Scaffold this active site. Structure first.
Site, PDB file in Angstrom:
ATOM      1  N   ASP A  15     -30.232  67.271 -61.522  1.00 59.06           N
ATOM      2  CA  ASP A  15     -29.026  68.031 -61.199  1.00 59.06           C
ATOM      3  C   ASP A  15     -27.996  67.115 -60.547  1.00 59.06           C
ATOM      4  O   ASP A  15     -26.805  67.203 -60.830  1.00 59.06           O
ATOM      5  CB  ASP A  15     -29.370  69.181 -60.237  1.00 59.06           C
ATOM      6  CG  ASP A  15     -28.211  70.155 -60.029  1.00 59.06           C
ATOM      7  OD1 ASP A  15     -28.229  70.882 -59.014  1.00 59.06           O
ATOM      8  OD2 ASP A  15     -27.293  70.209 -60.878  1.00 59.06           O
ATOM      9  N   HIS A 206     -31.053  77.689 -54.595  1.00 58.34           N
ATOM     10  CA  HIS A 206     -30.343  76.451 -54.870  1.00 58.34           C
ATOM     11  C   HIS A 206     -28.877  76.712 -54.510  1.00 58.34           C
ATOM     12  O   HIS A 206     -28.124  77.308 -55.288  1.00 58.34           O
ATOM     13  CB  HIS A 206     -30.500  76.107 -56.358  1.00 58.34           C
ATOM     14  CG  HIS A 206     -29.751  74.882 -56.790  1.00 58.34           C
ATOM     15  ND1 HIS A 206     -29.564  74.560 -58.114  1.00 58.34           N
ATOM     16  CD2 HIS A 206     -29.135  73.912 -56.077  1.00 58.34           C
ATOM     17  CE1 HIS A 206     -28.862  73.445 -58.200  1.00 58.34           C
ATOM     18  NE2 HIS A 206     -28.589  73.030 -56.980  1.00 58.34           N
ATOM     19  N   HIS A 208     -25.048  75.404 -53.452  1.00 55.72           N
ATOM     20  CA  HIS A 208     -24.095  74.305 -53.476  1.00 55.72           C
ATOM     21  C   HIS A 208     -23.270  74.366 -52.200  1.00 55.72           C
ATOM     22  O   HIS A 208     -23.116  75.433 -51.603  1.00 55.72           O
ATOM     23  CB  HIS A 208     -23.205  74.395 -54.713  1.00 55.72           C
ATOM     24  CG  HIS A 208     -23.828  73.793 -55.933  1.00 55.72           C
ATOM     25  ND1 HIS A 208     -23.422  74.110 -57.210  1.00 55.72           N
ATOM     26  CD2 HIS A 208     -24.843  72.910 -56.067  1.00 55.72           C
ATOM     27  CE1 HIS A 208     -24.165  73.450 -58.081  1.00 55.72           C
ATOM     28  NE2 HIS A 208     -25.036  72.714 -57.414  1.00 55.72           N
ATOM     29  N   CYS A 239     -19.096  69.481 -58.402  1.00 54.04           N
ATOM     30  CA  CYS A 239     -18.907  70.742 -59.122  1.00 54.04           C
ATOM     31  C   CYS A 239     -17.830  70.639 -60.208  1.00 54.04           C
ATOM     32  O   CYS A 239     -16.720  70.160 -59.957  1.00 54.04           O
ATOM     33  CB  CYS A 239     -18.533  71.860 -58.148  1.00 54.04           C
ATOM     34  SG  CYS A 239     -18.418  73.502 -58.912  1.00 54.04           S
ATOM     35  N   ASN A 248     -24.235  69.516 -54.464  1.00 57.50           N
ATOM     36  CA  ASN A 248     -25.470  70.061 -53.909  1.00 57.50           C
ATOM     37  C   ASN A 248     -25.609  69.922 -52.393  1.00 57.50           C
ATOM     38  O   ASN A 248     -24.955  69.099 -51.754  1.00 57.50           O
ATOM     39  CB  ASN A 248     -26.682  69.391 -54.571  1.00 57.50           C
ATOM     40  CG  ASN A 248     -26.924  69.876 -55.995  1.00 57.50           C
ATOM     41  OD1 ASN A 248     -27.209  71.051 -56.217  1.00 57.50           O
ATOM     42  ND2 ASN A 248     -26.820  68.963 -56.965  1.00 57.50           N
TER      43      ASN A 248
END
Lengths: 296, 296
Positions: A15, A206, A208, A239, A248
């Protein structure tokens, strides 16, 4: 009800890197993952078996999975967006795969052109083979705290998709705030609805940090009983729907908090930072980890 | 549960500017403060009436306090380290002053050679003169969640100093995590002890984000019932007893979280972001606000 121990699922090599401009050599990826193993992470999302046409940063997926050290007790799941990709993961030696959906129709139509029910047809085929191949599967639900296209997402819908994934065989489902727009109450409402349908231990979050809410939203999930949370090393992976904004939640900042809470992670923060600094230099960027900045 | 409304105490022009590398002219400071009043903040820490020989970045305290617009219902408290400063502040029109101590003996000794008990003697005189003059006094307890020299700090000790400030006359006391080493458990414990002795309404929290725990620590305080929190426009103000990491919590990121929670703050986010961008350009620095970075 804070958990005594939390399983941090590291997503930096996958990711994290997937969402980075400048690409990195295969040898740098393998070293990053090895260093992460070194730091103690029990699960490190290693790569994604998807066409280099769609995502070129993960093009070395086969050789990456093959070249990383397989530490005892550590898991190295990989993403398998379609039956073929899964097929390739098993051959490459993957012991765990990851399918990813979303609680948003628009987001699904943009990310895979298909519908939500349709994406489930695709997933059923993978879970099926996965079950024959004896491969555990982890699900992922995008836009769990809001969508960049549809906007507000419903706790009922997030609970519905999470429910689908779990009943088809997924052993753990990660709920992601992809655009990092969630705030505490939103997280609590979402988790609350999901917890009615899916047992607590099968849930992960998860978050951000695009709007600086990741740790706060993570704290809320923890207070709700969630025991597995996703994060990326030096806060890697920006992003797509934002400016030059963070991505993240930084794993180092998360371990700091957990350790402060006296919560077991099994991660060695000093080694975690080395890993973080190793990749930031390779990427020629600045770590997004506050812990890392205050530490050196 | 959470309060329905929070009183945000903006410290950018005072705590923030003092701890910033570059300096800005007097008109810039005035404009910044006017911009914060326009954004809706109910309290804006304006300057510090301290010797120019000691903290030159606050040298223009008199003209700054006299030149800002005094919006109706808005408070412009200023710091007065000693009686001379307090007298200078009063003579300049100050209606509220702020005094600062610490829950750490070592921190107090390296910053005034007086113990914690002695530091209260110097405040005693200010408080008496302030009562006679009808001037409000806010108290501030640094190193509430840890000290850079003593390390861990006892909750009971923070409670004790806070009770002292309150019984001495301070209507409100801000508990600051000076170095930002705090985590939610630590914050919860400190507040729990303080609340035994001081009514909830008299409490405020001031969390640095040096380790990325600012918003999370702030959230814990809100969950404990605290209804006032200190923050700085674009996360202005670094940390001296720390490294090149950040300092104050960005007000914009705080307002973003509070709006999501549906908690009234009476602050206009878009106008607050304008204020941030303005002072940032004047300082030739990038904002520390995540909301700012993702909004443009």
């Amino acid at each position: 009800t804070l958990p005594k121990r939390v399983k941090i699922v590291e997503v930096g090599p996958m990711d994290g890197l997937q969402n980075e401009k400048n690409i990195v050599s295969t040898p740098v990826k393998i070293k990053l993952i090895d260093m992460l193993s070194e730091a103690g992470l029990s699960v490190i999302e290693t790569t994604s078996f998807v066409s280099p046409k769609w995502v070129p940063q993960m093009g070395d997926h086969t050789e990456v999975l093959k070249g990383i050290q397989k530490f005892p007790g550590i898991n190295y799941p990989v993403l398998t967006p379609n039956l073929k990709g899964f097929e390739a993961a098993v051959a490459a030696g993957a012991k765990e795969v990851v399918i990813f959906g979303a609680a948003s129709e628009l987001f699904t139509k943009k990310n895979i052109n298909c519908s939500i029910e349709e994406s489930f047809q695709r997933f059923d085929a993978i879970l099926k083979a996965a079950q024959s191949a004896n491969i555990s599967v982890r699900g992922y639900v995008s836009c769990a705290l809001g969508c960049p296209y549809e906007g507000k997402i419903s706790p009922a819908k997030v609970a519905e998709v999470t429910k689908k994934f779990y009943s088809m065989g997924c052993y753990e489902i990660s709920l992601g705030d992809t655009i990092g727009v969630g705030t505490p109450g939103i997280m609590k409402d979402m988790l609350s609805a999901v917890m009615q349908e899916v047992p607590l231990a099968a849930l992960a979050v998860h978050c951000h940090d695009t709007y600086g809410q990741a740790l706060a939203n993570t704290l809320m999930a923890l207070q709700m009983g969630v025991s597995v949370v996703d994060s990326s090393v030096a806060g890697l992976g920006g992003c797509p729907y934002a400016q030059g904004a963070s991505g993240n939640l930084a794993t180092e900042d998360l371990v700091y908090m957990l350790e402060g809470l006296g919560i077991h992670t099994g991660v060695n923060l000093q080694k975690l930072l080395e890993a973080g600094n190793f990749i930031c230099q390779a990427l020629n960027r600045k770590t997004s980890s506050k812990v890392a900045q205050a530490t050196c």
